Subunit: 335 residues, 3 copies
Amino acid sequence: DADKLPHTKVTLVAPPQVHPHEQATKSGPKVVEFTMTIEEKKMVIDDKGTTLQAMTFNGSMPGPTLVVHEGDYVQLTLVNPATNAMPHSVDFHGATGALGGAKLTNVNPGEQATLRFKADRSGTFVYHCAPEGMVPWHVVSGMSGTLMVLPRDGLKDPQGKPLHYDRAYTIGEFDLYIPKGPDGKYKDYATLAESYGDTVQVMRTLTPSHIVFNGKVGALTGANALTAKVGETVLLIHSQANRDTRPHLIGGFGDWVWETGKFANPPQRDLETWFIRGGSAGAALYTFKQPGVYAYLNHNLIEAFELGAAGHIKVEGKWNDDLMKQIKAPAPIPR
Amino acid sequence: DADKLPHTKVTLVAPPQVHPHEQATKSGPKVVEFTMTIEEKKMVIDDKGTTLQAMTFNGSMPGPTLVVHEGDYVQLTLVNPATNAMPHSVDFHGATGALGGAKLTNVNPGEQATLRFKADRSGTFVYHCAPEGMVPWHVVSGMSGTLMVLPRDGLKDPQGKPLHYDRAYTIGEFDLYIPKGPDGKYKDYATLAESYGDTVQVMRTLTPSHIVFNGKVGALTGANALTAKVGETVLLIHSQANRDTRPHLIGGFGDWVWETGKFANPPQRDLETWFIRGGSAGAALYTFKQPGVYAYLNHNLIEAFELGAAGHIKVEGKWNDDLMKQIKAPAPIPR
Amino acid sequence: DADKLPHTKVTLVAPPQVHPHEQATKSGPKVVEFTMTIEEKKMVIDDKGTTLQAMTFNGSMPGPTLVVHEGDYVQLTLVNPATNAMPHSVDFHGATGALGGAKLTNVNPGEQATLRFKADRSGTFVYHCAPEGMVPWHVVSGMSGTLMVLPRDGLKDPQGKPLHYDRAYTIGEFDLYIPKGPDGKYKDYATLAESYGDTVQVMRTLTPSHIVFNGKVGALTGANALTAKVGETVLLIHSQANRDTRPHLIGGFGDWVWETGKFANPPQRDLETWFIRGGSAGAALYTFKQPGVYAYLNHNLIEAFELGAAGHIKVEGKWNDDLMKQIKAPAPIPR
Ligand SMILES: [Cu+2]
Ligand SMILES: [Cu+2]
Ligand SMILES: [Cu+2]
Ligand SMILES: [Zn+2]
Ligand SMILES: [Zn+2]
Ligand SMILES: [Zn+2]
Ligand SMILES: [Zn+2]
Ligand SMILES: [Zn+2]
Ligand SMILES: [Zn+2]
Ligand SMILES: [Zn+2]
Ligand SMILES: [Zn+2]
Ligand SMILES: [Zn+2]
C-alpha cells in the first residue's frame, strides 16, 4: 500500500511555530518525508546564567512539530552528526512496533537512519529519544517534541460539528535537573558526559530545579511572546515527555480540549485548567474575546512563577465591557 | 445588556457551607452583587501549635463559595482594609480578560475595587489572589475559593436527565509550606513579611509540610464533621488552587463527578477516586445509602493521614444488610 | 435477596495472572466466595539486595485480583494468622459502607472475619488494608490489590458495541519508602515493627525510594515477562493504592482505556499514555499488531528506569512492514 502512494517533503519550522499544513483535506494518503538532525549543545536556561548540557532535535527544545493526516505514512531521516558525542534514536508514540521506532533508528555519531511508519491514529503524540540504558537522561536533557496527526476531515466537537484553528503554537515543557555544588550554586560542566552522574542523582530526587517552556525561563515572553487577535482561534499544543503538567490560560479558557491529545475522542469544553500526563501531548483550542497580555502557564503556581513554566500571549483588538468591566477602580474605602 | 438587568445582593456564608441558592431556576439573568474583605492573620494549622502567616478572603480558608447561574454577571466589591500589610487582587477563572480580573482589582491596604464580569460558562471555577510578583505566595497562604456557575436548568447527566443535590459543601485543600529552624521545629513569625523568604525556599522544594482541608488539620472532623442522612444527595465541591489532589469517599463513591468541574461536559459515574488538577475546582454528587462516619480524603494516603488532607462526614439512618453484611465477626481461626 | 442466591467459590491465582472468569455471562447474580490470608514478610525488592519489611494479601504484591459480575455479592473470608505481628483489615473501594468494610474486618493475629457486600457498580476497584491509625504504612508496605466487577453483558465501547479481551494481566504499582542510614545505604530491619518510625519519616518526604511493579524491580521482565501474540487483545489492569501513575506501552497504545476504571463510562481510544489516580485501578485494552518485546511502564521515565516502574511484554508473530519499516538502516552520513 505505502509503496504505491505519492511522496511529499515537508520543511520543518522552529517552535513555537508549526509548519504550514491543511486541517480538513481532500488529499488522499501520502508518504510524508521529514528530516531532523540531532544537536548536543550547552544552553543557558535562566536569567542568572545557569547552563544545561542539553540534547536537541534540530537545535531546539522542543524539537519541531511534525504534522500529517491520519492514514499518512511518516518517513523520517534521523541524522546524528559526527560532532555529537552520544548515540541517539527516536521513539514515536504515534508508531506501532519496535519500541516506537527506537530499535530501528539507533544512530551513533556519524550515522543516519530512515524510518517509515503508518500514522493510523489521530492526535498529538510525543516523540522522544530513547537510547538503550540512557532514556530518561536524553529526554530530560531536551530530546522530545510532538507529532500531530490530524483527522483527514479536520477536528470535530462531541456532536460531530467542525472545529478549526487559525493559528497553531507548540509548547514543550521541560522539567530540568541541574546539579549544585557544595556552595549551593548550579554546576557548569565542560562536556555532556561530565554532567551525567550528578544529573542522575538530581533526577532520582524527582524534584526539578527548573521547569521551562521551550528551553528557558521566559522563552515565550517579551519579544518572543505568542501573539493572536480578538476573534482568532488558536491551537495550543502542549507536550511533556516526562512529568505531568496542568496548563491554564489566565483570563481565558480551553474552549475545546483534548487533554489526552487524541482527536477521535470527544473534547471537553470550558476548561479552566487541563492536565497533560507525563509522556503525552495534548491540545486546546481557544477563541480570543478580549485583548491584552495573557499568561499561559502550568497551574502549579510554584512551578510556573518560581521554576519557569509560564509564557505570555499578546492579543490585539477591542475591549468588551459586556464580558468584563471595572465598575469602580481601586480607591479609598468609604468611611 | 448588563446595564438593563436587575441586580440582586447575596450574603456569603463561611465554608464548608454554601450560601442558599436555586439549582434549576425560572429567573432570567441578573447582576449578582457580592462583597469580600481580605484578612491577613496568623492561624494555628495543626494539633501541635504550628502557625501559618495566612492570607484570606473573608477570614476563612478557603474563601466563601459564590454561586450564580450561567448568563448572570458577577459584580464583586473586593475590600483590602488598612489593617492589612500587603496589596491584593482577585483572578476569577470563571472571567474573561484582564488576567481574570486581577489587572482591575489591584487594591492596596485602605482601598477597594468593584469588578463585573459575565459568568458565561457553567462549572465550578477557582478564584484566587494574584498580585504582581507575589502570586504563588498569596495563593499557598490561603487566598483561594470557588465560584460555582450553575446551568440555568440545573445539573444534567450524560443523557440529559436531571441531577440534583439536597445539600452542598465546599472543601478547599491547601498545600502549605511552613519553614523549619535549625532545631527541626516549625518557625513562628511575628509578621507576614518576615515569613516570605523562608517560605519561598520551602515552596521551591515542591514538598508541602502540611496539606489541609479548610485551614487546619482536622478542620472537618469532630463537632465540625460534615453531616448528611441516608437518601440525601450531597454535592462536594473541591478546590485546589495550586496542586493536584485525588478526592475519595471511604465507603462511598462519586456517583456523578465532573472532575474538571465544567457542567456542560457529561459527568462520569461510579468513581472510586477522582482527580482535581491544581488550579481548578471539581464537583461530585453522592447519594448516601448507609449510615456511619465516612472519611472524605485525598487518596495519597500519606497526604491524607500524615499531612492533613482528610475530613469526616457523619451520616444518619438505617443500616442496609443487602449492601453490606458482617457474615462472621472477627473470631479465632478454626482449628 | 442475597440469602436466596446460589453461592460459588473461586480459587484465586497469583499476579500477574487473573483467575479464570467469563466476560459476558448468561448467569444471574451469585454470592461469590473468596478467601485471602495475610502474610507479613521481608522481601528483596531490587537488584542490590535492598529489603522491604512487607505486608501482603496472599503472599504477593499486589494481592490477587478478584473478579465478579455487576450485581454479584462478594463474600470474603480474611484470615490473619497468629504468625503475623499486626492487626489488619480490608477496605474495598467497590463496597458501600463501614469504611469499605474495614470496620467489619478488623482482625488481630489469630483471627479471621467474613464480609459480604453487593458489587453493584462495574469497574476495576482497589482494595487495601486500612487498620485504625496505621493506614498509609500498611498500604505502602504492600497491602493492596484489585476487585474487577465486569458488566454482566461484558465490556462496551462508547457506541455500545462489544469489546473483549483474550488474556488479562494485573499490575500493581507500589511506591516504596525505604529508609537509609548515615552511610547512605538502605536500612535492613530485623522485624516489621522496627521499620515503622524510620519509614514514616521517609513517607512524609513524599519521595519514594523505589517504585515497583508487582513487588520488585524487574518483576515483570526476563522469564517473568508478560506474553501475548499478534492478534490477541490483552486487558492490562493497573492499580496504584497511594500515588498517581501514567501507564504507557512502548510501541503500542491503549486502544480502549477506562483510566478512572469504571466500565459504565465510555472508554477513550488511541491513548499514548493514560493516568491512574492514586487510590484507584484502571483498565486498558490493546490488540497487538507487531511482534517483539514491548515495555509497559510509568511514563515518568525517572520513575520507570531509575526507580523500577517498568515491565516487559514479549509478543510472538509476524512483522508488518505496512505499519513500520526500516527504510534505511543506520549507516554513515552521505558526503
Ligand atoms: Cu538522545
Ligand atoms: Cu493576596
Ligand atoms: Cu494491614
Ligand atoms: Zn514510494
Ligand atoms: Zn477561525
Ligand atoms: Zn515515550
Ligand atoms: Zn445595573
Ligand atoms: Zn435529593
Ligand atoms: Zn489561577
Ligand atoms: Zn446464601
Ligand atoms: Zn480477541
Ligand atoms: Zn482507599
